[PDB]
Amino acid sequence: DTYKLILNGXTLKGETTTEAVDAATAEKVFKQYANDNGVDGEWTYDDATKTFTVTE
């Protein structure tokens, strides 16, 4: 299924997606993505819309 990540680094904002077998697997992709792209902070997950957010 399609999972989405909403990033808010402060100045820099964006959204990415990934096709993953389950939510834990998408979470690993998104956590590495946020780490590799300098966004570090508060995490949310809405299973009903398969949407993560991370906010600096």
Author numbering: 1 to 56
Manuscript text:
Despite the low helix propensity of threonine, we were surprised to note the shortest d and θ between COi+1⋯COi+2 at the type-II′ β-turn in 5 with an En→π* of 0.46 kcal mol−1. An overlay of the type-II′ β-turns of both the β-branched amino acids valine and threonine revealed a clear difference in the side-chain rotamer conformation. Valine in 4 crystallized in a gauche− (g−) side-chain rotameric conformation, whereas threonine in 5 crystallized in a gauche+ (g+) conformation. From the statistical analyses of protein structures, it is known that β-branched amino acids favor the g+ side-chain conformation over g− in helices. Thus, Thr25 in the α-helix of GB1 with a g+ conformation engages in an n → π* interaction, whereas Thr11 at the i + 2 residue in loop L1 with a g− conformation lacks the n → π* interaction. Moreover, our dataset revealed that Thr with a g− conformation at the i + 2 residue in the β-turns does not engage in an n → π* interaction. Therefore, despite the low helix propensity, the n → π* interaction in threonine at the type-II′ β-turn in 5 is a result of the altered side-chain rotamer conformation. 5 with the strongest COi+1 → COi+2 n → π* interaction displayed the maximum stability (TM) and 4 with no detectable COi+1 → COi+2 n → π* interaction showed the least stability. The Ramachandran plot of the i + 2 residue in the type-II′ β-turn of 2, 3, 4, and 5 revealed that, as the strength of the n → π* interaction increases, the torsion angles of an amino acid in a non-helical region in the absence of the stabilizing intramolecular hydrogen bond are gradually altered to occupy the right-handed α-helical region.
